[PDB]
Amino acid sequence: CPPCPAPELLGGPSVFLFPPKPKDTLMISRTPEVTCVVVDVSHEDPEVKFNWYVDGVEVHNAKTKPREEQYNSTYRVVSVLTVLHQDWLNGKEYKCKVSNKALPAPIEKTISKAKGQPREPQVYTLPPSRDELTKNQVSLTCLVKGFYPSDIAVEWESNGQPENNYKTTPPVLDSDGSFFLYSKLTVDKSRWQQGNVFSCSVMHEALHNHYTQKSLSLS
Amino acid sequence: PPCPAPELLGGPSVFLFPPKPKDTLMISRTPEVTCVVVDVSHEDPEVKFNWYVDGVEVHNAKTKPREEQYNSTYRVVSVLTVLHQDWLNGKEYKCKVSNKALPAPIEKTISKAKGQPREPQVYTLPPSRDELTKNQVSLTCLVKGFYPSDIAVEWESNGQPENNYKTTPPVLDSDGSFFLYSKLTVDKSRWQQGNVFSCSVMHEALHNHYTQKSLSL
Amino acid sequence: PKAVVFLEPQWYRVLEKDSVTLKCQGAYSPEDQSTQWFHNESLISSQASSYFIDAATVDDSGEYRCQTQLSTLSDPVQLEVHIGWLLLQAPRWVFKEEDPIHLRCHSWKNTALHKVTYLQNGKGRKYFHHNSDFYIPKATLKDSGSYFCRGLVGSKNVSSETVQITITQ
Numbered sequence: 328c329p330p331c332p333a334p335e336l337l338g339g340p341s342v343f344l345f346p347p348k349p350k351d352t353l354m355i356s357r358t359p360e361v362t363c364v365v366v367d368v369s370h371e372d373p374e375v376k377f378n379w380y381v382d383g384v385e386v387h388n389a390k391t392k393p394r395e396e397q398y399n400s401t402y403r404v405v406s407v408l409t410v411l412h413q414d415w416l417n418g419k420e421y422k423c424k425v426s427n428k429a430l431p432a433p434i435e436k437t438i439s440k441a442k443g444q445p446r447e448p449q450v451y452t453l454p455p456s457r458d459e460l461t462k463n464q465v466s467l468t469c470l471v472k473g474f475y476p477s478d479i480a481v482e483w484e485s486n487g488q489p490e491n492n493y494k495t496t497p498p499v500l501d502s503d504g505s506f507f508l509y510s511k512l513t514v515d516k517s518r519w520q521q522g523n524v525f526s527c528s529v530m531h532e533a534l535h536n537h538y539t540q541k542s543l544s545l546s
Numbered sequence: 547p548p549c550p551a552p553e554l555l556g557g558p559s560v561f562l563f564p565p566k567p568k569d570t571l572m573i574s575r576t577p578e579v580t581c582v583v584v585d586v587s588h589e590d591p592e593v594k595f596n597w598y599v600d601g602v603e604v605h606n607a608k609t610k611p612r613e614e615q616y617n618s619t620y621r622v623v624s625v626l627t628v629l630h631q632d633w634l635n636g637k638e639y640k641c642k643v644s645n646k647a648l649p650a651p652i653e654k655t656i657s658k659a660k661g662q663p664r665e666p667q668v669y670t671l672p673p674s675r676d677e678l679t680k681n682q683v684s685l686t687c688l689v690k691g692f693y694p695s696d697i698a699v700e701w702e703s704n705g706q707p708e709n710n711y712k713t714t715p716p717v718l719d720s721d722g723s724f725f726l727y728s729k730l731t732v733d734k735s736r737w738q739q740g741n742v743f744s745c746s747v748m749h750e751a752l753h754n755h756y757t758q759k760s761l762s763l
Numbered sequence: 764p765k766a767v768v769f770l771e772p773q774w775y776r777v778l779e780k781d782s783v784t785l786k787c788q789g790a791y792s793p794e795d796q797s798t799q800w801f802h803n804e805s806l807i808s809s810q811a812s813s814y815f816i817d818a819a820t821v822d823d824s825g826e827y828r829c830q831t832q833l834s835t836l837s838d839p840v841q842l843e844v845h846i847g848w849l850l851l852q853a854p855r856w857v858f859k860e861e862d863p864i865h866l867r868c869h870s871w872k873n874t875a876l877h878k879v880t881y882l883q884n885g886k887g888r889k890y891f892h893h894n895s896d897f898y899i900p901k902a903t904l905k906d907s908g909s910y911f912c913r914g915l916v917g918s919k920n921v922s923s924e925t926v927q928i929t930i931t932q
């Protein structure tokens with residue numbers, strides 16, 4: 328019979344390990360990071376030690392931030408490990424190990440990219456329905472489908488400038504085991520009818536150069 | 547034997563679920579609210595339910611026998627049929643749960659979202675020209691500007707159900723309304739022929755709680 | 764020749780299921796007295812020198828008076844039986860500068876409680892991984908204010924009612 332978690336685990340600092348932003352792992356100009364956050368560190372036992380491993384091999388270049396006093400009278404201590412895009416993308420495992428006097432043994436968290444055959448997404452822009460033209464604002468639709476894993480970034484622009492008024496749905500599991508989503512950009516009807524070419528930018532690991540961009544424009 | 551779950555130190559937890567959107571909108575269905583009590587211990591297994599509608603106690607609820615769970619706790623479920631209009635009129639349903647492993651009864655309240663109902667705008671969207679080179683094409687239903695988020699969406703063709711579709715959850719839009727999209731995938735031959743598809747939406751703020759929008763080449 | 768009621772333990776604020784002994788002190792004489800007890804100005808059955816409440820319920824709240832043969836009727840003592848998970852118990856409300864302040868986050872049935880905070884004026888004052896008493900060794904003016912406690916019991920985030928603590932100059 329297996330050993331059980333002890334109740335001593337219940338009162339001690341807690342650890343949360345966060346993956347990098349998907350955009351950060353895909354684009355050359357970005358630096359993806361793995362973030363290990365320790366909460367509920369007491370004032371009585373405030374020292375926190377981190378060890379980091381990439382596939383079981385210790386690395387020493389993590390940057391530990393100074394502890395922050397929380398409003399609730401605990402400390403919060405963050406350690407950030409900068410990662411190589413390719414390491415992340417090739418499914419290497421990142422371990423954060425946290426040691427503290429209030430813990431009988433260190434807490435280990437490990438994260439890595441979702442496993443499985445990557446699948447290239449298909450990107451399609453759709454103009455507003457004729458019916459929406461009676462409205463003051465129109466919807467520009469970006470369908471992204473057939474991508475795996477679900478990690479993806481979707482953005483909108485017009486004339487090189489980023490657009491702010493869009494919303495993207497969560498990824499939805501499709502029948503074939505791939506994901507799809509939709510992004511809706513709202514624009515002033517006048518801005519649509521003016522002829523402005525709008526752009527949907529999609530960043531996913533299985534796209535060529537991790538990037539594709541489809542356009543949307545009036546007649 | 548399972549591991550002694552420390553969550554038991556706090557006694558039972560209570561979860562109170564609204565009726566399914568379709569149930570409240572369609573007169574052929576029975577909407578109900580479901581009060582589910584989890585983490586009931588073996589040593590304190592008796593659970594008492596009281597139900598109130600706008601604060602007035604009712605006695606028509608149906609409580610199931612306690613059910614032994616895999617993790618060595620009981621789960622017990624009590625369901626109250628609600629009236630269609632009552633639910634749509636914003637009435638509050640309260641499930642009070644009494645158990646000896648608690649220092650006081652736990653009270654949970656559910657009702658319809660507050661705020662003016664806003665009518666769905668339903669727009670059907672043909673496959674992108676780019677997609678017409680593929681064997682399968684995506685037919686899109688954009689449902690937007692609706693409040694509350696309770697809604698149901700389906701597809702038909704020739705007034706029969708088409709079931710090769712997926713619908714995203716509702717998303718909070720930037721104007722405080724909700725939107726979603728539904729995707730029907732069909733053979734490109736069917737679109738190019740071209741058959742007539744319909745996206746059908748159920749929502750309280752629609753006339754007869756129902757609207758239909760067609761899509762054709 | 765007044766009788767006096769003593770509480771043991773001394774907390775007049777308790778939670779349901781706490782034990783509480785009310786002790787009647789009559790005349791300090793070898794002359795054996797009998798005892799009588801009043802709750803909310805009504806006679807109750809016990810004629811024991813110690814009236815014991817096994818498992819307190821809300822109805823045990825109210826005023827208690829006792830009397831012995833050689834005693835006049837005692838001044839009332841108040842008992843408050845609270846309903847809930849947590850009760851912040853203090854031995855008193857008013858302290859002077861440099862007095863120790865000792866507070867207890869009492870839980871229902873002494874149930875184990877984790878990740879416990881004692882808040883002062885809505886801001887965290889002291890955090891403990893496990894339930895533990897709050898200790899200020901030398902009280903200062905700035906320690907006055909509204910105090911409550913909270914923590915985790917199982918998965919539940921629970922909290923006590925507020926109490927006012929005063930430090931005087």
Ligand SMILES: *[C@@H]1O[C@H](CO[C@@H]2O[C@@H](C)[C@@H](O)[C@@H](O)[C@@H]2O)[C@@H](O[C@@H]2O[C@H](CO)[C@@H](O[C@@H]3O[C@H](CO[C@H]4O[C@H](CO)[C@@H](O)[C@H](O)[C@@H]4O[C@@H]4O[C@H](CO)[C@@H](O)[C@H](O)[C@H]4NC(C)=O)[C@@H](O)[C@H](O[C@@H]4O[C@H](CO)[C@@H](O)[C@H](O)[C@@H]4O[C@@H]4O[C@H](CO)[C@@H](O)[C@H](O)[C@H]4NC(C)=O)[C@@H]3O)[C@H](O)[C@H]2NC(C)=O)[C@H](O)[C@H]1NC(C)=O
Nearest residue numbers: 551553554561563564566580582584585615616617619621
């Ligand atoms: C011992 O076993 C118990 C039984 O378990 C089942 O078998 C076990 C052995 C296990 O293997 C499981 O596979 C399986 O679940 C287990 O019970 C579970 O306990 C958890 C809580 O600990 C409870 O979690 C809640 O689930 C809510 C959603 O439930 C619905 O969806 C689930 C999965 O999607 C379904 O499994 C579940 O059955 C339920 O399904 C709906 O049921 C109704 C009617 O029955 C249908 O009408 C409806 O269509 C059903 N289906 C779907 C798909 O909807 C979730 O909403 C809960 O709340 C979140 O709760 C937590 C609080 O814990 C918060 O963190 C979140 O914020 C959110 O809470 C709410 O958030 C809002 C704030 O914005 C606010 O509105 C609320 O006030 C706030 N509430 C609170 C309290 O904060 C929650 O996660 C499971 O539902 C329950 N499972 C079952 C079947 O009952 C025991 O926990 C386990 N015990 C131990 C010690 O191990």
Ligand SMILES: *[C@@H]1O[C@H](CO[C@H]2O[C@@H](C)[C@@H](O)[C@@H](O)[C@@H]2O)[C@@H](O[C@@H]2O[C@H](CO)[C@@H](O[C@@H]3O[C@H](CO[C@H]4O[C@H](CO)[C@@H](O)[C@H](O)[C@@H]4O[C@@H]4O[C@H](CO)[C@@H](O)[C@H](O)[C@H]4NC(C)=O)[C@@H](O)[C@H](O[C@H]4O[C@H](CO)[C@@H](O)[C@H](O)[C@@H]4O[C@@H]4O[C@H](CO)[C@@H](O)[C@H](O)[C@H]4NC(C)=O)[C@@H]3O)[C@H](O)[C@H]2NC(C)=O)[C@H](O)[C@H]1NC(C)=O
Nearest residue numbers: 341343345346362364366367397398399401403878880890
């Ligand atoms: C004293 O105060 C502390 C900090 O003060 C702040 O409180 C927060 C809550 C805030 O609201 C402000 O009020 C205050 O400034 C409290 O610390 C909090 O502690 C809780 C735990 O008690 C932490 O909760 C976890 O949160 C993560 C998600 O956190 C992200 O998102 C939060 C908002 O959504 C955000 O506030 C966080 O900062 C964090 O943001 C991310 O940060 C990283 C890097 O910084 C970025 O890269 C991200 O982009 C950014 N994301 C976003 C979005 O902004 C949540 O994931 C955790 O849930 C898991 O764990 C639960 C256990 O508690 C479990 O029950 C859940 O089901 C869930 O389970 C996990 O599920 C996955 C997948 O299924 C599994 O893989 C996991 O293994 C599994 N884990 C399990 C089972 O354990 C959890 O909710 C909270 O993050 C933290 N806040 C801050 C800030 O650090 C402190 O609690 C309090 N102490 C006391 C005594 O009161």
Ligand SMILES: *[C@@H]1O[C@H](CO)[C@@H](O[C@@H]2O[C@H](CO)[C@@H](O[C@@H]3O[C@H](CO[C@@H]4O[C@H](CO)[C@@H](O)[C@H](O)[C@@H]4O)[C@@H](O)[C@H](O[C@@H]4O[C@H](CO)[C@@H](O)[C@H](O)[C@@H]4O)[C@@H]3O)[C@H](O)[C@H]2NC(C)=O)[C@H](O)[C@H]1NC(C)=O
Nearest residue numbers: 398399877878879880882885886913914915919920921922
């Ligand atoms: C127990 O369960 C309780 C449930 O109440 C939890 O207690 C709550 O904890 C939350 C944090 O986990 C608290 O919410 C936050 O409160 C912060 C308060 O700080 C503010 O301080 C200044 C005063 O000068 C004022 O602005 C406010 O009035 C606040 O008091 C907020 O800052 C915080 O909001 C965040 O702030 C950052 C600032 O950088 C924002 O950028 C960010 O977007 C975010 O919104 C948030 O509102 C909550 O206060 C608290 N409740 C009470 C009653 O104290 C416990 O966490 C649970 N757990 C345990 C173990 O007890």
Ligand SMILES: *[C@@H]1O[C@H](CO)[C@@H](O[C@@H]2O[C@H](CO)[C@@H](O)[C@H](O)[C@H]2NC(C)=O)[C@H](O)[C@H]1NC(C)=O
Nearest residue numbers: 802803805821822823824825826842843844845
């Ligand atoms: C003793 O007299 C007191 C009056 O203080 C009663 O206390 C109240 O009891 C009700 C429920 O019984 C509670 O809802 C109130 O909160 C109580 N008030 C206080 C201040 O605690 C008590 O019930 C009486 N008991 C008897 C046997 O008469």
